[PDB]
Write a protein that binds this ligand. Structure first.
Ligand SMILES: [Zn+2]
Lengths: 301, 161, 98, 99, 100
């Protein structure tokens, strides 16, 4: 498909040193890209190393940093997991540097809490929701400032429980400053797609293609992202784009680690389909099944 | 006064959901509690949502969710689900066809030299269009897909930018 | 069953499994532990880089065996590059330093 | 229906092209209309052949542009890619037109 | 022809290419019966102001090889003499001596 998931220009030519469509059938000009083909010109294994990226219309926070126990965004923004998910699934609002009003920065807001505030603080007031709001919070979170505060808080208290609760928060706050990891990199904005060769589309004996599960996951994320771009073109009302961004959030969260959210999606028939984290973890991931133990030539039985 | 609400159906069975909804209204004869049922259509937004003129009693809420192939309302909460707006209805009344208007009675997709033909006999490939007859709705795409490389009078809708 | 050099799988460039598919026996995890338990280091290196996964390594190996050489050019397992692409396809940025 | 207008200066070449096109059509699709010969354009030119002066001294040249009208009545799926890999011989301007 | 003449011709062509949109517009304005008198006058004056070489009726068709003003043919862009030579050599496609 030009240009779909399994593109030509974005990745490479199926055949080795061939424009899939039609030009270069010898070994002279390896690289030329005509307008009739919109195709690169390299090796058959070149697509296995090349990866694509999906421009997610609406920001979506990572599931590995939101539900890892303890969550990476749970002990960093000083907010309970329950409240973090509420806002993340378009079910709660979050304040962000309101101004001269009677409201905190971490404190959340509900429909009734926002409605009344909307008519009250109609001017200088900011109260978003979802990953966008979360991203802002993380983005506008002076790491260094928190360190001293946390450090001073730990030296000005005697509470055993608090001490352990403060030492676990300051440990992940100073470790982030030691490296080049930003707080706004937790939310996924430019979702990456695994190489086609690594998500292979081979037909079994017959005339149909036995498709992998990751192609279902990526194809749903792209279907939803196209729908969300079209609705933000058309200026749909608030509840439509909240459901649309929420379905995109759940689609991305299902692509990365399926089933960590409520009941896992399924294609055929009731069995859930296998995601990227389920290509890593488990007895049948890459470590325990292809890197620690391998199948071996020059062997017999 | 009847205000609007948004219903989610199984996307694809939407006309059958609308018909079954009208029939459940005329079965349980709460005729004074329902005004219309909208599925708008362009020459189809919205992709899977049914608009209902309604009032909010819990009986009518159970009625709409007891209509088959309906998931539920979409709002702030499930106790008191949310109507949409009214200030954006005045601007929508003046314009109800922004994705198919006569504002640009010519170019539907930038011709230039990057288009693909799929409608009609010739299909699936692509060519470079030098001149174009927008007035008479004609294109001179020298698509080299079907044949050598001659300009084949194609239709704007038949081709794709 | 016996296999010198047969077909290779598609997603991870390792030999196929079974007998009907002309395949090679799984040098499993506990056998890797049992070769770590000796001092056999080159046997394990060719047992999981040359004989199994690395495609340029095994074509260099086949030329070197039919010419009498008896030498391996090691390289990298291609399935480790598959691990890099699967971890990298998340929001995670895994690399190889230096 | 696909009308095809072959135009060329050499007649033999044009004929060859036409046949090829027919072949391309006929294997994939069905009911090719036929190779209908339209009128030839004989665009003539007179010129003075002297460098300076001698007006009755003249050469009269011409370019015979031949036309071949091939039509295809049923455009199938496959018929569209029948002539995709088969570009025609050089010096023959083709002009396909569906409908 | 001379080099100089050729150069001049080229310049004229360039000018024509440049000033076409404006000149055409001006002409249209001048023509347009449903228009103000003063406006028309202005247009007429405006045209005068523009360079003379900007006019397409200024440039002469010369032979593309020799620059010979006379004996020109449009189809070939060549003067008769050169055209004949081309024909003889086989360089003009399709062209052969005609008899009837
Ligand atoms: Zn090409």
């Amino acid at each position: 498909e030009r240009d779909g998931l399994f593109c030509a220009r974005i990745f490479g030519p199926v055949k080795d040193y061939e424009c899939l469509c039609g030009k270069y059938k010898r070994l002279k000009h390896r690289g030329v890209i005509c307008e009739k083909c919109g195709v690169e010109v390299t090796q058959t294994k070149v697509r296995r190393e090349r990866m694509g990226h999906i421009e997610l219309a609406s920001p979506t926070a990572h599931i590995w940093f939101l539900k890892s126990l303890p969550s990476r965004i749970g002990l960093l923004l000083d907010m309970p997991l329950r409240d973090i998910e509420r806002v993340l699934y378009f079910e709660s609002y979050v304040v962000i540097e309101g101004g001269m009003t009677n409201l905190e920065r971490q404190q959340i807001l509900t429909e009734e809490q926002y409605l009344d505030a909307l008519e009250e603080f109609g001017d200088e007031f900011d109260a978003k929701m979802g990953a966008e709001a979360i991203q802002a919070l993380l983005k506008s979170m002076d790491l260094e400032q928190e360190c001293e505060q946390l450090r001073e808080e730990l030296n000005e208290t005697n509470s055993e429980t608090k001490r352990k609760k403060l030492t676990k928060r300051i440990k992940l706050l100073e470790a982030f400053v030691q490296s080049g990891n930003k707080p706004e990199w937790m939310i996924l904005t430019v979702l990456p797609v695994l190489p086609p060769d690594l998500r292979p589309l081979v037909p079994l004996d017959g005339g149909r293609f036995a498709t992998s599960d990751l192609n279902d996951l990526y194809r749903r994320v792209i279907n939803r992202n196209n729908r969300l771009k079209r609705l933000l073109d058309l200026a749909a009302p608030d509840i439509i784009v909240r459901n649309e961004k929420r379905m995109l959030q759940e689609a991305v969260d299902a692509l990365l680690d399926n089933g960590r959210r409520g009941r896992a999606i399924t294609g055929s028939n009731k069995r859930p389909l296998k995601s990227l984290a389920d290509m890593i973890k488990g007895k049948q991931g890459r470590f325990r099944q292809n890197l620690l133990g391998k199948r071996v030539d020059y062997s017999g039985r | 006064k009847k205000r609007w609400y948004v219903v989610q159906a199984f996307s694809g069975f939407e006309g059958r959901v609308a018909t079954s909804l009208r029939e459940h209204i005329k079965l349980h004869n709460m005729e004074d509690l329902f005004g219309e049922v909208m599925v708008p259509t362009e020459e189809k937004f919205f992709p899977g949502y049914v608009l209902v003129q309604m009032v909010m009693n819990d009986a009518s809420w159970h009625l709409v969710r007891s209509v088959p192939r309906v998931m539920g309302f979409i709002g702030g909460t499930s106790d008191r689900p949310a109507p949409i707006s009214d200030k954006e209805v005045d601007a929508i009344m003046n314009r109800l066809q922004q994705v198919g208007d006569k504002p640009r009675p010519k170019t539907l997709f930038e011709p230039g030299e990057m288009v693909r033909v799929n409608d009609g006999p010739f299909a699936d490939f692509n060519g470079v269009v030098e001149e174009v007859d927008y007035e008479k709705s004609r294109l001179k795409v020298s698509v080299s897909i079907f044949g050598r490389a001659t300009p084949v009078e194609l239709d704007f809708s038949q081709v794709e930018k | 069953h016996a296999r010198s050099t047969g077909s290779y799988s598609l997603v991870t460039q390792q030999p196929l499994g079974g007998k009907a598919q002309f395949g090679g026996q799984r040098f499993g995890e506990m056998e890797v532990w049992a070769l770590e338990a000796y001092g056999a280091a080159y046997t394990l290196q060719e047992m999981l880089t040359v004989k199994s996964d690395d495609v340029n390594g095994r074509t260099k190996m086949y030329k070197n065996i039919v010419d009498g050489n008896h030498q391996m050019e090691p390289g990298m397992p291609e399935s480790f590059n598959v691990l890099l692409k699967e971890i990298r396809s998340l929001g995670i940025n895994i690399e190889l330093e230096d | 229906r696909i009308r095809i207008r072959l135009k060329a200066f050499d007649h033999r070449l044009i004929d060859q092209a036409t046949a090829e096109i027919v072949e391309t059509a006929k294997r994939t699709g069905a009911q090719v209309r036929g190779p209908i010969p339209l009128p030839t354009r004989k665009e003539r030119f007179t010129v003075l052949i002297s460098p300076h002066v001698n007006k009755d001294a003249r050469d009269q040249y011409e370019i015979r542009t031949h036309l071949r009208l091939v039509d295809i009545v049923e455009p199938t799926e496959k018929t569209v890619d029948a002539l995709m890999r088969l570009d025609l011989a050089a010096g023959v301007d083709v002009q396909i037109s569906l409908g | 022809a001379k080099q100089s003449m050729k150069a001049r011709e080229v310049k004229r062509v360039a000018l024509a290419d440049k000033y076409f949109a404006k000149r055409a517009e001006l002409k249209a304005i001048i023509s347009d019966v449903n228009a103000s008198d003063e406006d028309r006058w202005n247009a007429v004056l405006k045209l005068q102001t523009l360079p003379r070489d900007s006019s397409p009726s200024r440039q002469r068709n010369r032979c593309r090889q020799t620059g010979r003003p006379h004996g020109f043919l449009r189809k070939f862009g060549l003067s008769r003499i050169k055209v004949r030579e081309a024909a003889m050599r086989g360089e003009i496609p399709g062209l052969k001596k005609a008899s009837w």
